[PDB]
Amino acid sequence: RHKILHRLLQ
Amino acid sequence: HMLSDEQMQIINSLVEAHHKTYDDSYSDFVRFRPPVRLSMLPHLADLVSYSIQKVIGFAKMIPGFRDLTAEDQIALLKSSAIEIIMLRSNQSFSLEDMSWSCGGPDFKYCINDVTKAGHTLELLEPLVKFQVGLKKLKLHEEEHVLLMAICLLSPDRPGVQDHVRIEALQDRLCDVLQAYIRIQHPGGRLLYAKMIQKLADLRSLNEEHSKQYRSLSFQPEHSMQLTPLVLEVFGSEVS
Ligand SMILES: C=C1/C(=C\C=C\c2cc(CCCCCC(C)(C)O)cc(CCCCCC(C)(C)O)c2)C[C@@H](O)C[C@@H]1O
After folding, report:
1. How many Å is the maximal CA-CA distance in chain A?
2. Helix, strand or coil for residue B134?
3. Burial zone of B59 (CB within 10 Å; 0-12 exposed, 13-18 middle, 19+ buried)
4. Could you tell me where the DSSP H helices lie in chain B?
5. Which residues make Cβ contacts (< 8 Å) with residue B200, sequence separation at least 6?
6. What's the rounded Cα separation, in Å, for the pair B37 and B112?
7. Atom of ligand 1 at shortest distance to CA of B111?
8. If we measure between CA atoms, which residue out of B228, B233, B227 comes closest to residue B210?
9. 9aaTAD: where is this motif (chain B)?
């Protein structure tokens, strides 16, 4: 989905 | 009048967040794809992608932002990242050079490129005017940081759901900014009004860049020079 954004937000 | 402990503690964590997420040495720029003088797009895309990670790092340390739903955090970051990047770039903008100067002479971005980065003067001309007006405001470190946090916690952005909760956070930050200027800024009688007008300028700059970014991402020969994070944040995908 928002793969990198979810990861970057822990 | 006098600031309270809750308002000064919001300032403390906000100034701390900016110091963690902004490197005045600009030493990480050596790891980007070098600039070529759309030859500047590879370096420009790496520069923006790097800054987006800083904005996400700065956002996660704003009080209350972390407690929002992940959807609200995405919607806020997707629509405000470009404006917060423009806001934070004022720290490298020089009125003497009329350009962004980051440490070395190879990381000095100055106007004539512009067409080598994939953008037109319909964005650069208002942006440079925005950057010089913000530079003339001589914002304190506390004021520059509050403006970034107020800009991020804008409820009137496409995508946010819990509008009431985000608005309450933003108003608390606005009262801090109003109380800080009155008590701590000499001659700040009308600064809060000029700072809020900068937010209105950002929405106009946001709209113009997004129009020009669409032309880049619609040509695969150019969008392949972008980064996955840029394509994710500046994209149109909806949560
Ligand atoms: C991003 C930052 C810095 C400078 C900002 C300059 C900056 C400059 C611009 C102006 C237009 C592009 C550069 C033209 C040129 C420099 C050759 O005259 C626009 C923007 C907004 C983002 C542009 C997105 C480009 C894509 C994705 C291709 O859409 C930032 C350095 C430092 O201050 C840290 C800060 O975090």
Report:
1. 15
2. helix
3. buried
4. 5-21, 41-60, 70-88, 121-136, 141-152, 163-184, 191-217, 220-223, 228-233
5. none
6. 10
7. 18
8. B233
9. 228-236
User: Distance between CA B19 and CA B155 in Å, rounded?
Assistant: 26
Q: Which DSSP symbol is given to B93? A: E
Given in angstroms, what resolution was this structure solved at? 2.6
Helix (H, G, I), strand (E, B) or coil at B109: strand
CB B213 within 8 A of CB B32: no
Q: Whose CA is nearest to atom 34 of ligand 1?
A: B89
Task: Report whether B102 contacts B89 (CB < 8 A).
Answer: no
**CA angle B135–B188–B61, rounded 5-degree value:** 65
CA distances from B192 to B42, B177, B217 (A): 37, 7, 37
